[PDB]
Amino acid sequence: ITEAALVRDILYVFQGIDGKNIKMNNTENCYKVEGKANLSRSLRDTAVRLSELGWLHNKIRRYTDQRSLDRSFGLVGQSFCAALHQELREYYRLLSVLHSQLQLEDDQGVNLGLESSLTLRRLLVWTYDPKIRLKTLAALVDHCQGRKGGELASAVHAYTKTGDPYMRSLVQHILSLVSHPVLSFLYRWIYDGELEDTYHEFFVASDPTVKTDRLWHDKYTLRKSMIPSFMTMDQSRKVL
Amino acid sequence: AAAAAAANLNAVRETMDVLLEISRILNTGLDMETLSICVRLCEQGINPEALSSVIKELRKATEALKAAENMTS
């Protein structure tokens, strides 16, 4: 088995595609290398290491597809999915650059023992930071699984508490992007009384059945579950 | 005073926008906050020619300091 074939399979896995000799094992929920004898055990371990990245990629893509189709995610959910898609796009841009570099290494044909030659170890090194990024994104997705609206915002704030400064910065950027629409809807409701809560995602609830006599008492309510974790309960009461 | 403060803030914003455009053409490394500080200094009567020479010297010094920090880190 040529190394180039493994490179092609790894690029496919980075694209979420099963390679010719490396296929996703649904039983292991991971890409598995075809049992052809010519794979080095070290090479097998490297394939498994890359298949962890491919599994993360496939999980991310499954999440994106699951939420891109869900109209019930609401505007805030759509914004969160959009931010996730943007980060995935950045990752895919990096992956495309890496693929072009691998294509250059394959096309040059020379086993240049230079420190610049695309080795499986060099590929792993170049993807190490991307691997950490994808791990962080996957952990965020897992923690945010099933959460929506203010619960999604609270989950995002929980992920903002990560110690990793790169993860912290990324999560801060994602939180700000997702909150810009969320804060817009919330603040528009609490300051202007506008409630574009198609999914009842904002922390202010309005009872349309409440008469004007109880308008001050009953017309407006707090969706406590929809209260973002970046807002205090006293802040939420003031907004209400 | 409050009206004066608001006028100063609006003037700073306008100056920052103009300065941002000039800066973008200017490709030299001058920031808005330093510009505001200089404006306060300039309001105190600093010679604009002296100010420009100082700014150029500060940019050269900042580049030398960045090289020194990159060598010492």
């Binding site: - | 105190q44 009567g45 600093i46 010679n47 002296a50």
Partner: protein
């Protein structure tokens, strides 16, 4: 750590001498320009009392020392006692060898060339300094203002000077000296406090009255309006508690005292007001530079620390200067220490390091170098 031998910075204010190292933001030593010698040689000789104390040491020994001021009304009056004071400052407060450090000296405006020569001789022969310079205090404050043309108002305790400077050169025909400063205002404040019923008669009570003036007196933008306000409202009136718990009340004296800057007759001084002195200095200056001098009016010295002095100076200069003259009064918040700051700034220039008079140049030219080398 490269021990770059710091030049010495000595700010000789009319009231207090302030000294420190070049490149410091403030003088490291600041003490009254007073040298005290023991009043009773006999009794305290056995207790290790020095025959004389200088600066803060003179104040600490004031009980047993007779204090002398080698600088009188901003003018050096005892060159031997001034040299002894500088030596004491150097060796005890700064704890430096002046032979190892260049020394930037300050001078009063219109300081006699011969007095500069005697100071230079003392500095070069007694302290064996490797390099020195003598600068006019107001010039250093002007350099601290980043200007080469303008008027510097340096006001200490003992003397006031108005020094027009054009393109880095002082305008000697337009330099004015005023023998009215913080000491005269302190005596006026003591008088008005005695009239108020607070008795201040001792040099300790005189210093208390001086501190009261520095803390509670301010310069009115309009002296008559502030006096009228204090007479019609106690809002300008201030009570002051003496260290013995006696409460004194000060009304227009809060602004009448510094009103002497515009109306020195309010202090019983025959000197012209700050507006008249500024006008006379400007008129003695070239018309082409007068606009820039008005635009570059720098306040310096401890007597420029008075609150409201900037507004009063602005009003007065506007009433006194030509309406077409751009007048800008610079009253730095540190103008009480402006001399020292300017000396530190000036002495920090790399190109200035060649301007110091070296010990070799002193030995080559003698004390007359002050009149021959420093122009």
């Amino acid at each position: 750590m490269d021990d770059d031998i710091a030049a010495l910075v000595v700010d000789n204010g009319s009231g207090m001498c302030k000294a420190g190292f070049a490149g410091d933001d403030a003088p490291r030593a600041v003490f009254p320009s007073i040298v005290g010698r023991p009043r009773h040689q006999g009794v305290m000789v056995g207790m290790g009392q020095k025959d004389s104390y200088v600066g803060d040491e003179a104040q600490s020994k004031r009980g047993i020392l007779t204090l002398k001021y080698p600088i009188e009304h901003g003018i050096v009056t005892n060159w031997d006692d001034m040299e002894k004071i500088w030596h004491h400052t150097f060796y005890n407060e700064l704890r430096v060898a002046p032979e190892e450090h260049p020394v930037l000296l300050t001078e009063a405006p219109l300081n006699p060339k011969a007095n500069r020569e005697k100071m230079t001789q003392i500095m070069f022969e007694t302290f064996n300094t490797p390099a020195m310079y003598v600068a006019i205090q107001a010039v250093l404050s002007l350099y601290a203002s980043g200007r080469t043309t303008g008027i510097v108002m340096d006001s200490g305790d003992g003397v006031t000077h108005t020094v027009p400077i054009y393109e880095g050169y002082a305008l000697p025909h337009a330099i004015l000296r005023l023998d009215l400063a913080g000491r005269d205002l302190t005596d006026y404040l003591m008088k008005i406090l005695t009239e108020r019923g607070y008795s201040f008669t001792t040099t300790a009570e005189r210093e208390i009255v001086r501190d009261i003036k520095e803390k509670l007196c301010y310069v009115a933008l309009d002296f008559e309006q502030e006096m009228a306000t204090a007479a019609s409202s106690s809002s300008l009136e201030k009570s002051y508690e003496l260290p013995d718990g006696q409460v004194i009340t000060i009304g227009n004296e809060r602004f009448r005292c510094p009103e002497a800057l515009f109306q020195p007759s309010f202090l019983g001084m025959e000197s012209c007001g700050i507006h008249e002195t500024t006008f006379n200095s400007i008129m003695k200056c070239d018309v082409d530079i007068r606009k820039d001098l008005y635009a570059n009016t720098v306040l310096s010295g401890g007597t420029t620390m008075y609150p409201g002095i900037a507004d009063r100076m602005q009003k007065e200069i506007t009433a006194l200067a030509p309406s077409t003259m751009k007048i800008k009064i610079i009253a730095p918040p540190e103008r009480k220490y402006s001399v020292w700051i300017g000396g530190s700034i000036l002495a920090s220039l790399s190109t200035f390091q060649q301007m110091w008079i070296s010990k070799q140049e002193y030995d080559e030219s003698g004390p007359s170098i002050v009149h021959r080398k420093c122009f």
